[PDB]
Amino acid sequence: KYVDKIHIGNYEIDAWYFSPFPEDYGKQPKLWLCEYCLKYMKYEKSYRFHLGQCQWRQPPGKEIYRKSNISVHEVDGKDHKIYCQNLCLLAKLFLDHKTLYFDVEPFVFYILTEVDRQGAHIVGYFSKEKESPDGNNVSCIMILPPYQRRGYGRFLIAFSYELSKLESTVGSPEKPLSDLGKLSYRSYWSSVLLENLRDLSIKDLSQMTSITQNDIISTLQSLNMVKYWKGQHVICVTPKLVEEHLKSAQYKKPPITVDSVCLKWAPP
Ligand SMILES: CCOc1cc(C)c(F)c(C(=O)NNS(=O)(=O)c2ccc3ccccc3c2)c1
Ligand code: NA
Ligand SMILES: [Zn+2]
Structure with a gap:
């Protein structure tokens, strides 16, 4: 049982x-x-x-983000071993493909909380390898079911890329993603690329966003905004077509935004 x-x-x-x-x-x-x-x-x-x-009335570790009542704590797996193991056991109840729960030392954990008078209430998290040979800026990412599809996962994805920007690198989540994670990442990539195209080469979008070229290319293909010429993908979009895509309801919900000014973090 x-x-x-x-x-x-x-x-x-x-x-x-x-x-x-x-x-x-x-x-x-x-x-x-x-x-x-x-x-x-x-x-x-x-x-x-x-x-x-x-x-305790909040996660351990350092509060690396605080704006209004939205908070992110950075927790080193080596410094807070039992806490991070219990977090992984909790996450595994809602992630099919998570396999690591007890060897938490190689990971750093980013805990999202929503704060009120009584304390900072856990919403979700993502883990991240201290050293990623594969260029993964997220290992596992999980929003607890009662908070899902309410903008918190969008915040956490955006947050993982803000860290990559500060590290002067591109990154991608570790595969395979959950189904909700898959849908969430594709919508995030689409929203970010469309917004930048409204306001560039594929390499330019990669440096501006820290999204890998592969993830940009697969997203631009799904939007049918890329041409192919002699072995190279090439962005092919009119400023009007970008607007039409942003019209879609799936971008209508107001995001919890990551305010770079409130991110208190220096790259390792
Ligand atoms: C057990 C799996 O746990 C997860 C994991 C991830 C990565 C999630 F993202 C979620 C989630 O809850 N997603 N829904 S979302 O936050 O409202 C959202 C996300 C991206 C968006 C992009 C563009 C416009 C709106 C968006 C809304 C749950
Ligand atoms: Na339930
Ligand atoms: Zn307790």
Whole structure:
């Protein structure tokens, strides 16, 4: 018997996938998680006692982004091992393709929280290899189900590319993506490229956005905005066609924007 339901914060959430919590935790009807320190517990009574004792009201690590009540904490897997392992166990309940939960030292974790009077409430995260040979600027990215399709995933994707810009590099998420992640990345790439084309070579868009040339090219192909000439992809778009694409409803929702001015981060 696996964990099939969690209580975290004020949410009850059904599991989507197997996550390797210890056997005696999976057997329980529900797993109870402290939303601040991510300790998982077997019983409502141990949960209620913990909530009166726990002094955490936000993730550990350094707050590298704060604008209004939106916050991002950077958490080193080597500095906060247990927390990052519990985060990976939580994430695995909603990610099919995540395979690493306990060897968290090679990773840095970026925790998105929404803050109110009581504390900073976890929304989602992405992990990232301290050293990525493959040029991946995201390893795994997960938004908890009650926050999905509400702009938080768009914020986290945009945030991962802001880090890449500061690192003077391009990057791409590690594959395979979840289905929602796949849809979200394609819409993000489209929105960014169309906006830049409205206001360039493929190499130019790559340096401006930190999106890889491959991801630009596949996105421009899906939009039918590229020609091919003697082995080279070439941007082929009229300023009117760009506007028409931005009209589509899928870009109508107002984003939670990443304000470069509020990002407190120096590249390693
Ligand atoms: C278990 C998987 O967890 C995830 C993972 C990722 C990467 C997600 F993005 C999400 C999510 O919740 N996506 N929906 S979104 O944030 O509203 C959104 C995202 C991109 C947009 C681009 C352009 C215009 C609007 C957009 C809205 C959930
Ligand atoms: Na649910
Ligand atoms: Zn706690």
